[PDB]
């Protein structure tokens, strides 16, 4: 049906603005909707921003205080939010979603883009592999991992396999600290599978433009 | 403004038993032309919200038959019928009547299951970190219920507690387990200083820990 996705820079410096595009598939933007911008802080907490609706005509929230701008480009199905003066407050994740303007019905939101309000610098991860002391690989299953170390800012994406290894797998929330963030994830499969089968951890960064595709090798001889 | 509160905080339930999930508003949810704006939605782990029911009493587009909203005026009910192991995560409550508009500060359903022992992994730092000078050692806890444990660090037989960081997933629908990681970072000449690393994790399974070490420079 229809379909949202939001893009747009993930890092802005306090005092500056973010701007934001959803680009809306599957469905006009000038028929039956509110679009809405709606973003979310720790905590399960839920601001609605404002929204445009189908005919162009807009509404925000008081709390946004004449820093709210929401706006769309019909010939490119899309709108936008621009959000200006913003402190570290205005960390949140962003979702654009549209629910009809007649009754509320069919909420469809995007994914969501996290937008990190921040004076430090964007640094690429280390990614290291973690492979298994020798006396914990004579069981049934074994376990390997990845440690995504000293990035910022968030997110990354970790796949093990290119994603063909799904099952098993344990991806952890970062933690912040210094304004750098470490991510660790584990895999678990059946320990005769391993090394025959080998196992690669796929670590994207695109705030800076960085890939690793790093191949845990055991300890002991390779 | 319209005051979205939902209740209880937290709900634990196993699957086969029903849910409910209460959500008072402020101010009457109802309008001029006899709709009420009130909305319940479900934030899956890692995903965005999602609809459910939508004018207060209706099964919103494509959602499973089991979800039943109920109630009018400033008192509402979300009820499933017979809880599922995908259904965890955080139910909300919005309303459209008033702007601005609001939501509720969220209800997160657990689900409840047998308990389950964690499965420990120590790991040393890689050689290519030792390369940079510094030197994380990670312990995981993984598929265990419930979800508190407790994790202890020893060097060399000596409980270690600065520069230890924690993270915790979120429950999986895949088994209604929980996983927790811990990672010692310590500089490199400390780690090549010392010689034997534990993590210890304590958990509601046992009286006894889970202990699993290594020695540095030993396979």
């Known amino acids: 049906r229809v379909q949202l996705q939001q893009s747009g820079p993930g890092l802005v410096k306090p005092s500056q603005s973010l701007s934001l595009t959803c680009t809306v598939t599957?469905?006009?933007?000038?028929?039956?909707?509110?679009w809405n911008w709606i973003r979310q802080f720790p905590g399960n907490k839920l601001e609605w921003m404002g929204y445009?609706?189908?005919?162009?005509?807009?509404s925000h929230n008081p709390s946004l205080k004449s820093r709210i701008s929401i706006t769309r480009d019909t010939s490119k199905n899309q709108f936008f939010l621009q959000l200006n003066s913003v402190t570290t407050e205005d960390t949140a994740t962003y979702y654009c979603?549209?629910?009809?303007?007649?009754?509320?019905?069919?909420?469809?939101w995007g994914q969501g883009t996290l937008v990190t309000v921040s004076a430090a610098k964007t640094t690429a991860p280390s990614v290291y592999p973690l492979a298994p002391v020798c006396g914990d690989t004579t069981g049934s299953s074994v376990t390997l991992g990845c440690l995504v170390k000293g990035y910022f800012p968030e997110p990354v994406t970790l796949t093990w396999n290119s994603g063909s290894l799904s099952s098993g797998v344990h991806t952890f929330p970062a933690v912040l600290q210094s304004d750098l963030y470490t991510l660790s994830s584990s895999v678990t499969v059946t320990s005769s599978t391993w090394p025959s089968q080998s196992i690669t951890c796929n670590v994207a960064h695109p705030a800076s433009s960085t890939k690793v595709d790093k191949k845990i090798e055991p300890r002991g001889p390779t | 403004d319209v005051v979205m509160t939902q209740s209880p905080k937290t709900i634990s339930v196993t699957i086969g038993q029903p849910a409910s999930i209460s959500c008072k508003s402020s101010?009457?949810?109802?309008?001029?032309?006899?709709?009420?704006?009130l909305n319940w939605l479900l934030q899956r782990p890692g995903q965005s919200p999602k609809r459910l029911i939508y004018?207060?009493?209706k099964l919103d587009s494509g959602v499973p038959d089991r979800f039943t909203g109920s109630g009018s005026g400033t008192d509402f009910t979300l009820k499933i019928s017979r809880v599922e192991a995908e259904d965890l995560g955080v139910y909300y409550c919005?309303?459209?009547?008033?702007?601005?508009?609001?939501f509720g500060g969220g209800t997160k359903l657990e689900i409840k299951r047998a308990d389950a022992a964690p499965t420990v992994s120590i790991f040393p730092p890689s050689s290519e970190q030792l390369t940079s000078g510094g030197a994380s050692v990670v312990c995981f806890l993984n598929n265990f219920y419930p979800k508190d444990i407790n994790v202890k660090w020893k060097i060399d037989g000596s409980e270690r507690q600065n520069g230890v960081l924690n993270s915790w997933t979120d429950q999986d629908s895949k088994d209604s387990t929980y996983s927790m990681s811990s990672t010692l970072t310590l500089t490199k000449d400390e780690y090549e200083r010392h010689n034997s690393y534990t993590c210890e994790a304590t958990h509601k399974t046992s009286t006894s820990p889970i202990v699993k070490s290594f020695n540095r420079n030993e396979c």
């Open positions: 101010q009457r949810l109802l309008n001029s032309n006899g709709k009420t704006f």
């Open positions: 979603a549209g629910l009809l303007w007649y009754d509320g019905g069919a909420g469809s």
């Open positions: 004018l207060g009493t």
């Open positions: 919005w309303q459209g009547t008033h702007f601005p508009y609001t």
């Open positions: 445009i609706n189908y005919s162009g005509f807009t």
């Open positions: 599957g469905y006009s933007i000038t028929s039956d909707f509110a």
